[PDB]
Nucleic acid binder design. Structure first.
Lengths: 116, 65, 150
RNA sequence: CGCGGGGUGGAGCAGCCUGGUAGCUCGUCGGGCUCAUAACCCGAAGGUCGUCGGUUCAAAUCCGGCCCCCGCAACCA
RNA sequence: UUGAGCCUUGAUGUGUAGGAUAGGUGGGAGGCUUUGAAGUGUGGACGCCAGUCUGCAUGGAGCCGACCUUGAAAUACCACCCUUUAAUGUUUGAUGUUCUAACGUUGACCCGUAAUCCGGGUUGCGGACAGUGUCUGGUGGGUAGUUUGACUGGGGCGGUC
RNA sequence: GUUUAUUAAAAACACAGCACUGUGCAAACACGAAAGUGGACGUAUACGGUGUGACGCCUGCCCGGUGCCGGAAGGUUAAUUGAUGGGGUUAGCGCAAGCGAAGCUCUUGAUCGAAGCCCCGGUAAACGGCGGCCGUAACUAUAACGGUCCUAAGGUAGCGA
RNA sequence: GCGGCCCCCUGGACGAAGACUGACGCUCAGGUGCGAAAGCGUGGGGAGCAAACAGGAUUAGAUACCCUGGUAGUCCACGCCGUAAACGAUGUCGACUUGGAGGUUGUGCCCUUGAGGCGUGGCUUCCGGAGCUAACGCGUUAAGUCGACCGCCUGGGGAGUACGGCCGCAAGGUUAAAACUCAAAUGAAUUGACGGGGGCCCGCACAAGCGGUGGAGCAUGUGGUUUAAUUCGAUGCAACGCG
């Protein structure tokens, strides 16, 4: 399990679900535990409290790897990005750095026209 | 956007995440390019914005405020 | 299952309150045509006089012809096998100028024709606009509600 | 023709083996739940383990059978 | 590398009693200890996490066996070693790579010779593949040899044997 | 233009054109046991096969079946490998039967195993396919319509004795 | 209509003082050229988006909105198509006619003598006097006041269609009626009404609590049925122990 005290928190938030996973410094993932991975399948899949449980569900089950510090990367908007960081503050992990890595294109790809 | 907020912060308060937009182009790039409605919707909103400051000049009446 | 053609359009036109599972008596050519043989159910109502509750609007024609000598008409007022408990109460709450008994669906109960019948009430068109508005009102309400979480 | 295994709650899957102190969930009902239902949450239920014998302190386990599901190459009366 | 095979070796297994991670069968009451003990700080092993295994050094020189409640008994000591994990060496396939040296060149050089034939070496690029032989599954109207009955108011069809 | 030399000269073939598909060069393919050739002393604006047939407007829906292409998990899966299981003969025992060592044989088939098919998808200028029932309009009539049966879809544009 | 930056070629605009030509001016039927997007032809390319198409939902039905794919197209180059609510719905040019509040780009003077002060031009926004108008509004870039010229209008529907012409590969484009029908169609403003338009208010209206109906027996009234009669009237809310 490499006993890696360091950690990297790749948090991908969407408007329907929150993707919570912890990878190493090189980005190889340890494990993923999402809001759809802790019940709440359907209406309640976009909730910061459901993102809170998903932040807890990935906080544990990686305890074999022995992580105490992490740098936080947040991608995409959604119910997360303002509550899982509070969950990670209360998870016991060191909040070393919070970096917003939401990708902003320079209007290269044309968006669709849905939801009329 | 990228900040450690020093060592003993214990709370994010990352105002630079919301300083740029945090949802502006993050919702602008979602859908409805439309190629002329952003031209249209920036006309009347700026028309309303000038009118809001034009109707801000309605204090000159007595009004018994 | 063994369901036959159903009057789904009656729900748009009528707002039926209470239902029944009364059985229907039918002739020998009707049973063969009932499983398959193009049975229709539109504009189904009743013509009670004393105990003569008849499924009125039911167009079922013989697919394979099994008619000889005497006549055989595809549309008939088929006699319904109604319970006596369900019979005396229809001297009351069906005679109210708008109240009627319609058949929502047709099916089988172990090779017996049991027809799901219900006491319709009938919508005027001024409240028909409200219900179509209400169905769109329920959908668009959560669309506003979901925008708080975007 | 004789080679490969498994048969267990209503259901589909494990514990058996590396012996003793049979569960899980699907379908059920019990409740919550609710302008209304439901999403979803829990409460409960069920086969002595295909059958019959033996070994064994101890057989659902292991071994003898028998039966069933099959899979298989055979298939020149 | 990856697994298997076995050598060596520890680890490895509390129906219920019960202080016991006591396996079975079994030979056994002295093993053993200062060629440094009871029992420490614990590491790690560990596990039905009950509690042992347990490196080292302080500790420093005693502990357990029949003995005891147990169906049973004591790893005090072991034998066959079952069980279970890894190391060790060993025979093997399978996979990944490197190399050139078999093998390929209808890449290049010159030579036989003046001859894109062919052969000689030089040399390059491939390279133990490819391709060939034997065996073998699959495909195969591309091709070959043949079959497709009789009765019957002619025959076909139907019907029959 | 070509053709049934010698009963059929055309509504046939060919044709320009379009499309599909294959082929990266020692090409596919073809002749050929094989050397080697054609392709081609050409190499994707090239060559082979197929479908249609100037041109103009165009060419719809359907992948169940068959065929082709792709996928690799699993099921089945030859040769090999022979583990195991059975027998024969018999050194010897049984002074009777009966047994049985070693060896050599016959027999058994686990283990090894790709392609293939089963499976998962794509493919119709791949082969081909493209339906029905009754009820319904304030003259009769007629159904725009609604319900129904099955299919992968139910023949679109256009045309039609 | 045109924007990541760079380079290459090229048009126009405006500012300054002078020099110069000496009415070369304005406008325009025809004609000529350009002209969004979609589309057509040809050779390409194709991430994403996306008609059509297919599937999934919704509905009574949904060949739509929604959801999942997805071709043409979008993209490059060569030509074609000359059509848009191609509109500030206001043609082109000159002149004259209260202002105020902004932006952009010049240029001149004085004090840059402290993010300056004052002039003078172009382009241009908003509000507005006179005036105009049917009103809304327009308003020194007029819809005010005139002058020059061209295009066009003549009730609504038929009808921008028919036939004919020419242009076009096609789609189509331009030119342009008649028969017949109707007594209205239309533009602005106004009062109410409604709004699945917005903002505020209050009420047992909801919430919040507590008691009931609807289940049961009898009592009363209505409908329905019967009768010789079971008089008649009251029957959304605002009838149904009402007259």
């Amino acid at each position: 399990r490499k006993q890696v005290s360091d950690g990297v928190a790749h948090i991908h938030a969407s408007f329907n679900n929150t993707i919570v996973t912890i990878t190493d410094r090189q980005g190889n993932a340890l494990g993923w535990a999402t809001a759809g991975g802790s019940g709440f399948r359907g209406s309640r899949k976009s909730t910061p409290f459901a993102a809170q449980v998903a932040a807890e569900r990935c906080a544990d089950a990686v305890k074999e790897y022995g992580i105490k510090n992490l740098e936080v990367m947040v991608k995409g908007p959604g119910p997360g990005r303002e509550s899982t960081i509070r969950a990670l503050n209360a998870a016991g992990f060191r909040i070393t750095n919070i970096t917003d890595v939401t990708p902003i294109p320079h209007n290269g790809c044309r968006p669709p026209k849905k939801r009329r | 956007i990228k900040v450690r907020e020093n060592e003993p912060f214990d709370v994010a308060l990352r105002r630079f995440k919301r300083s740029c937009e945090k949802a502006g182009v993050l919702a602008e790039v979602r859908r409805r390019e439309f190629y002329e409605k952003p031209t249209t919707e920036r006309k009347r909103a700026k028309a309303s914005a000038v009118k809001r400051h034009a109707k801000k000049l309605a204090r000159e009446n007595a009004r018994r405020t | 299952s063994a369901t036959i053609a159903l009057n789904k359009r009656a729900r748009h036109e009528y707002f039926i309150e209470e239902e029944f599972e009364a059985g229907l008596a039918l002739q020998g050519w009707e049973v063969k045509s009932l499983r398959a043989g193009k049975a229709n159910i539109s504009d189904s109502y009743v013509l009670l006089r004393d105990g003569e509750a008849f499924l009125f609007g039911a167009n079922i024609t013989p697919m394979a012809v099994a008619s000889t000598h005497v006549v055989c008409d595809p549309t008939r007022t088929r006699k319904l096998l109604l319970n006596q408990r369900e019979l005396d109460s229809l001297y009351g709450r069906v005679n109210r100028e708008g109240y009627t008994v319609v058949a929502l669906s047709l099916y089988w109960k172990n090779a017996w024709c049991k027809v799901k019948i219900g006491v319709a009430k009938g919508k005027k068109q001024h409240d028909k606009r409200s219900d179509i508005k209400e169905r769109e009102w329920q959908v668009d309400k959560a669309r506003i509600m979901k925008n708080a979480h975007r």
